[PDB]
Structure formats: C-alpha cells, structure tokens
Design a protein around this ligand. Structure first.
Ligand SMILES: Cn1cc(-c2ccc(C(=O)Nc3ccccc3N)nc2)c2cc[nH]c2c1=O
Length: 125
C-alpha cells in the first residue's frame, strides 16, 4: 500500500526509568497538545491511502505523529527528553515539508507548534 507499518512504540530491552522531564513531556506537553481542537489530524499516522496522498511517504522519510509519541511516552520508550522533543519536531517538520505554506493543515500545525514551544520553554532542567 501507500502506508508503511506504524512506528514502534515500545522498547522491550530498555529498562524502565521515570524522569521529571519525561513526566512533564507526557503530562504537560503531550496532554496540552492532545486536547487542542487542532490535534486530531496529528493523533495517528498519516493514512496516505485514504487521504489520497500518493507521494507522502516518498517525501516523508521519517513518519511521526502524536499518537506514536503518546504511546512512546506511556511505554517509557524514550531514554531522555531530547529524544521525545526530536519526535515532536519531526512531526512538525513533516507537515511543513510536505504541505504547501498556508494550507489549513499547516495553520493547524503552526498553532500546535507554538503551544509546544511555549511548554518546552518551561521544561524542568
Ligand atoms: C499530518 N497531516 C494530516 C493530514 C490529515 C489527517 C487526517 C485527516 C482526516 O481524517 N480527515 C477527515 C476529515 C473529515 C472526515 C473524514 C476524514 N478522513 N485529514 C488530514 C493531512 C492531509 C494532508 N496533509 C496532511 C498532513 O500533513
């Protein structure tokens, strides 16, 4: 099909360890973006088949979405906060490199990214 397998969300050989920053990323950053009214197109991998975007996965080499990020956090997949922040950045980058500037989806991503950056600027050190 046009769709790859979804990204892995668990890391079985990784030991489970909580950190203040990972708690913040799940319970402040992800939670705030997830509840936002513009979150829904980002809550699951892009279905290029059903959306009829045949070139999506030609352009996007590293698929990423907030559902994957949520499950990675809930499964303690990330070793540190920077890995999680990278996934958020990749999700936004994908939207901005595939869609045309000013598209509704781009406006929705920009609103979410502003909120993300606002919350990331209060991440505990
Ligand atoms: C990250 N991302 C996401 C999307 C995206 C994802 C899901 C839906 C959706 O389910 N809409 C929908 C609305 C109402 C009824 C049924 C359906 N199916 N729409 C858009 C997209 C489209 C072009 N580009 C993107 C894009 O970059």
């Amino acid at each position: 099909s046009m769709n790859p397998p979804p990204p892995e969300t668990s890391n079985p050989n990784k030991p489970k360890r909580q950190t203040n920053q990972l708690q913040y990323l799940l319970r402040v950053v992800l939670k705030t973006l997830w509840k936002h009214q513009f979150a829904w197109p980002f809550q699951q991998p892009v279905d290029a088949v059903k959306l009829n975007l045949p070139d999506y996965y030609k352009i996007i080499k590293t698929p990423m979405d907030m559902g994957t990020i949520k499950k990675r956090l809930e499964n303690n997949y990330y070793w540190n906060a920077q890995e999680c922040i990278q996934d958020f950045n990749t999700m936004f980058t994908n939207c901005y490199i595939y869609n045309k500037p000013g598209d509704d989806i781009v406006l929705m991503a920009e609103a979410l990214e502003k909120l993300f950056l606002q919350k990331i600027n209060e991440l505990p050190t």
